[PDB]
Amino acid sequence: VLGKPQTDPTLEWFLSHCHIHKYPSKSTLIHQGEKAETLYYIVKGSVAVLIKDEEGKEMILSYLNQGDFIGELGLFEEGQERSAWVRAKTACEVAEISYKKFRQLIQVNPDILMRLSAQMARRLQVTSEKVGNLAFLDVTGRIAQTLLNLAKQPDAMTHPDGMQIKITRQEIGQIVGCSRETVGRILKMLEDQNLISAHGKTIVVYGTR
Amino acid sequence: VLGKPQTDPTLEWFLSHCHIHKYPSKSTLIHQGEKAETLYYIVKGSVAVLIKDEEGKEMILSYLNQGDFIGELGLFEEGQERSAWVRAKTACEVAEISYKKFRQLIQVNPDILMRLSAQMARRLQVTSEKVGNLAFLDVTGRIAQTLLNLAKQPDAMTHPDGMQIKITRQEIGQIVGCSRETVGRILKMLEDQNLISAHGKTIVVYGTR
Numbered sequence: 001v002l003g004k005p006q007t008d009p010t011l012e013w014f015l016s017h018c019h020i021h022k023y024p025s026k027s028t029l030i031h032q033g034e035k036a037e038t039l040y041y042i043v044k045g046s047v048a049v050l051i052k053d054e055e056g057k058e059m060i061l062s063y064l065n066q067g068d069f070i071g072e073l074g075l076f077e078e079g080q081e082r083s084a085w086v087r088a089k090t091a092c093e094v095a096e097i098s099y100k101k102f103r104q105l106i107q108v109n110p111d112i113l114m115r116l117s118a119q120m121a122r123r124l125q126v127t128s129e130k131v132g133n134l135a136f137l138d139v140t141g142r143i144a145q146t147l148l149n150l151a152k153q154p155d156a157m158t159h160p161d162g163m164q165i166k167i168t169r170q171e172i173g174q175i176v177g178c179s180r181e182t183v184g185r186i187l188k189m190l191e192d193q194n195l196i197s198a199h200g201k202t203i204v205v206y207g208t209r
Numbered sequence: 210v211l212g213k214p215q216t217d218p219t220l221e222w223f224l225s226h227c228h229i230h231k232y233p234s235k236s237t238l239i240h241q242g243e244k245a246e247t248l249y250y251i252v253k254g255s256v257a258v259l260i261k262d263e264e265g266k267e268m269i270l271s272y273l274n275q276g277d278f279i280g281e282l283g284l285f286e287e288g289q290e291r292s293a294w295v296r297a298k299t300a301c302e303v304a305e306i307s308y309k310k311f312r313q314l315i316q317v318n319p320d321i322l323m324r325l326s327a328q329m330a331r332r333l334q335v336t337s338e339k340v341g342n343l344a345f346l347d348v349t350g351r352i353a354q355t356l357l358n359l360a361k362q363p364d365a366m367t368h369p370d371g372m373q374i375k376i377t378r379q380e381i382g383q384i385v386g387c388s389r390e391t392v393g394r395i396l397k398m399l400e401d402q403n404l405i406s407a408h409g410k411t412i413v414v415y416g417t418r
Contacts, residue, residue, distance in 0.1 A: 051337035061340060073337075077330040084337055110319060117326050120333060121286040127336050128260035128293055131270060135344030135386075177344075 001043060006067070010109055015043065015095045017105050024091035029070065031058060031084040036074015039099045043067060045092015048171070049123070051084040059174045062123050063089055065154070069116045075099035076116060134177035142176045143186045144195060144209070151205055162197065162204035210252055215276070219318055224252065226314045227306035234297035238279065240267060242291045245283015248308045252276060254301015257380070258332070260293040268383045271332050272298055274363070278325045284308035285325065343386035351385045352395045353404060353418070360414055371406065371413035 001015070020043045030036045031050055042064050049062035062085075064070070073085035076099075106113035134142075150156060150165035157164050169180035169187040176183050190198040197204050210224070229252045239245045240259055251273050258271035271294075273279070282294035315322040345351075359365060359374035366373050378389030378396035385392050399405040399412055406413045 051340065053340065054338055054342045055345070057341055059341070061337065073330075073333065076326065077333055078327045079334065083334060107319065110316070113323075117285065118287050120330065121282075124282065124329060124333060124336070125286055125288065125292055127333075127340070128270065129262055131260065131262065131336070131340050132266055132268070132344060133263045135341060136264070 010112055010115075013109070014102075014105060014112060015041070018095035018097035018102065020044075020093050020095040022092040022094045022096075023088070025088035028087035030074060030082050031086055033082045035081055036071045036077075036079050036083060036085075037098060037100070038071055039075050039097060039102055040070035040086070041068075041095035042070050042092050043095050045088070045090040045094070047092065048087050048089035049085050050087050058084060060087070060171060061174070062126055066092070069119050070094060070096070071099070072116050072120055075103065076113070076120065134175055137177050139176050139178050139182045139186075143172055143183050146172065146175045147196060147203055148205060150203075157202075159204060162206040164199065164202040164204035166200070166202035168201050210276075219321055219324075222318070223311075223314055223321060224250070224304045227304035227311065229253075229302050229304040231301040231303045231305075232297070233300035237296035239283060239291045239295055240293040244289050245280045245286075245291055245294075246289070246308060247280055248284050248306060248311055249279035249295070250277075250304035251279050251301050252304050254297070254299040254303070256301065257296050257298035258294050259296050259383075267293060269296065269380060270383070271335055275301070278328050279303060279305070280308070281325050281329055284312065285322065285329070343384055346386050348385050348387050348391050348395075352381055352392050355381070355384050356405060356412055357414060359412075366411075368413065371415040373408065373411040373413040375409070375411035377410055 018041060020041070022042070022045055025045070025047070029040055031052070044066045046064045046066055046068070047070065048060040049064060050058055050060040052058045070086050073079055073083050077083055106116070147165070147167065150167060151163065153165070155165040169183050172183040172187060173179045180187065186195060187198065190196040190203055196209055197206050227250060229250070231254055234254070234256070238249055240261070253275045255273045255275055255277070256279065257269040258273065259267055259269040261267040279295050282288055282292050286292055315325070356374070356376065359376060360372065362374070364374040378392050381392040381396065382388045389396060395404060396407070399407040405418055406415050
């Protein structure tokens with residue numbers, strides 16, 4: 001896309017081959033058992049990659065950025081039955097098309113599929129160092145821990161009194177390992193400003209906390 | 210490799226380009242902070258892929274087969290600093306070479322690196338459904354659970370009285386989530402034949418259990 005420091009001709013060769021334009025979030029696309037025969041290039045917006053366990057827990061394990069890939073876990077993974085990896089996290093705009101036609105532009109350029117591969121591989125790098133993290137039930141300091149982590153990502157939204165990032169305690173179920181319950185204590189104190197200040201579900205770390 | 214039903218002329222084009230020949234196991238190659246600039250194609254033998262957490266726990270999270278890849282997590286992941294993924298699990302024979310020259314045979318054929326990619330992606334599929342599994346502290350029935358799982362893999366070794374698979378309870382720390390201690394009860398009962406029969410560290414599910 002233009003207007004931003006990208007400088008990716010090949011992608012503009014890809015985005016002219018797909019369909020950019022998504023929807024506001026909640027729009028999960030494939031993680032219930034649907035053959036992932038369609039790919040979605042999150043070009044703007046960002047989502048919450050989530051997986052299924054051996055006992056059916058489909059929790060969020062990863063998330064993307066404005067310019068990542070979606071459904072690779074079905075076209076590239078070799079899944080062909082959802083395999084799990086997507087649920088909208090923002091109103092995005094994905095360059096979504098079918099990997100029958102795409103696979104053949106990814107085959108016309110030995111850097112296109114290689115560009116996508118590395119994304120997932122980075123997720124391997126994200127899943128290889130945070131598996132037993134939330135599993136540790138470390139909730140003590142592991143909640144606000146991620147909230148300040150949001151202050152370090154493109155999501156910290158400045159506002160005339162603080163810079164927030166709305167995170168339902170549902171993300172926190174996942175990231176911390178405990179439901180919105182133990183973490184419900186904490187996320188409850190947030191609006192109490194006893195730890196933060198959640199302006200609704202938007203959480204504004206004022207400054208001191 | 211010849212003698213076995215493989216039928217992979219492209220690999221024989223690749224294995225004639227590398228170095229197959231490993232060692233008995235314990236031979237970890239890259240999982241401590243070594244730039245994974247070298248790749249190892251496990252051609253025979255199989256290893257125990259392990260990862261580092263956010264608190265330094267570097268536990269086995271995956272394992273291979275006789276004909277998988279190693280160090281992909283460094284050459285293809287784009288790691289370039291170990292990133293974690295290997296520790297010998299058997300005396301293997303890896304076709305190990307350096308990804309400078311390899312990358313250029315894998316670049317000579319668009320099915321070679323793609324063949325490897327899918328392997329890792331399959332590991333994505335292995336890590337996307339067993340993250341919170343061992344994290345569940347399900348040890349009740351989650352130990353023998355995997356021991357019988359070994360009876361379903363190429364490892365079940367027939368013997369004139371039972372068919373085993375040696376598994377230190379160390380694997381069980383990982384797979385079940387508890388140190389060989391809770392599982393130490395269990396693995397202790399195994400030699401007692403109160404649950405199994407471990408002929409040393411080799412475990413023989415006789416038949417009834």
